[PDB]
Amino acid sequence: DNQFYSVEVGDSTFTVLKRYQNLKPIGIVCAAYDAVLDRNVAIKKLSRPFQNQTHAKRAYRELVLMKCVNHKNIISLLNVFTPQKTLEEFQDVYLVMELMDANLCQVIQMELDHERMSYLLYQMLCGIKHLHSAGIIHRDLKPSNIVVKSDCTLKILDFGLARVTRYYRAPEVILGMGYKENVDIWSVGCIMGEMVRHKILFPGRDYIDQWNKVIEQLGTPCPEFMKKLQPTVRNYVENRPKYAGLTFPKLFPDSLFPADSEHNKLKASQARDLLSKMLVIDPAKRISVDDALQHPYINVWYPPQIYDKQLDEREHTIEEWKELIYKEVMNS
Template sequence: MLDWFEHEGHVCIVFELLGLSIFEFLRQNEFLPFSVEQIRRMAFQIFKAVCFLHRNKLTHTDLKPENILFVRSDYDLEYNEDLVREKRLRSLDLKVVDFGNTTFDHEPHESLVSTRYYRAPEVILGLGWNQSCDVWSLGCVIMEFYLGRALFPTHDSKEHLAMMEKVLGPIPPHLLKQTRKKHYVHSECLNWDDEYIRKHCRPLKLYMQMQNEEERQLFDLLSCMLEYDVSRRITLEEALWHPFFSPLRT
């Protein structure tokens, strides 16, 4: 915090001036996806920032491209390999912002957290949440960097869960047994039959565009982050040691 002042009854806080959010840059760049190398450098910074929060017993709870800002967003116009003119950032330095909903481990936890597209299944099912909900959100964010669009673009909870099943496979029955939202469940399975989802969503590995080692490593990391069972979901501390980040550690 650099300064603060009051304006018409509101307390205003002055922070350093940063560049565009990742969402705004994507929007201005025609939603062209980032390269795997750009994703690696961006994700490593974001994971370190949120890992710092987690070590200090905090959960951000609202991680999304709008809340991750470039330090500077100046760019050059270049033609990519498909001869499409795109904005190429001169720096990929990032900062995580907006701690308005950040929650200490010991504080009461609101039942509903995270912006819809980035909301973890345990939150939707009302099973309670902890720091691992940030890991799920970041899995969705990294996939958005790769695709240039949201992985789960919906505003309906049941449709959201159905999209997860199409992309990640069935939700484990033991999680569905625990939820009080029984209208989502039939015979211990998620109750859905949606032609739109069948057409527009596909299994995670089928989104992979290049069958090379670095993309396999990226998708292995994503599958560890987008794990339904909180007890099996990777932590950010572990994620920073994933082979995908080896080039940045050496």
């Protein structure tokens, strides 16, 4: 009541505890100063996350995982609150975490630096490894939901898909082929390659021109792969102009890298090598997390909890989702 005040942020209103002051905008996220803690924080507003059964299962899963998956490269919450006083009146959820400096999208725009790039990839792989260890296969990693401080410490912000822009999604996901752990490796590869090219690797104009930009560059998969494709998806892909692709030196030429020293030549070779092992259409030929972590480009950088599967299985009425979420917000 008198514990809260409201402030316009973009097109919306943030109603937050009075400890959170001087909200500035950075879906809906602001930077604030926490007066009690004497620290800067980031505050995210989930507005009516029970909009439907889909907004709801995600919001609930996300909220539960943020308080049970604990790892330095994974989001951890400082606080969770709602300004509403009762289940009946309940509408908004506010999540509060440490304020970081930038997300990977900005980092990608910086000139290429091997030490920094291999450092960011190391941490990303470590986060993912721990996620896999905690029973989470993500499938939806993207530069916009990965954040960093200026000392280049990194955090993944969300927990991915249940169970138009798909630039970072693995081929087995785009074609509905079912998946394993190394599905997240493709996304890391997309991100690595973007840090080198300073441009999105596979900028499809539609969720089907996306497939085109992948094969144009990497080549048509071997036929063995197209078998795992459903009858209707297999038809499209199989009966389609074959592409040879480019070799990895040509996808990522010398000119994109530091040079003029053998160390810089060594580093460009290692990076392309790693790239060629992650950007592999066929998941059965794609490198694993453990292997990527042992890779020369990466390895120079040196327990989880029992996953509740009902977290994904159980579907609910909108009314019950609301009550599950509310209950989670109230157990600070």
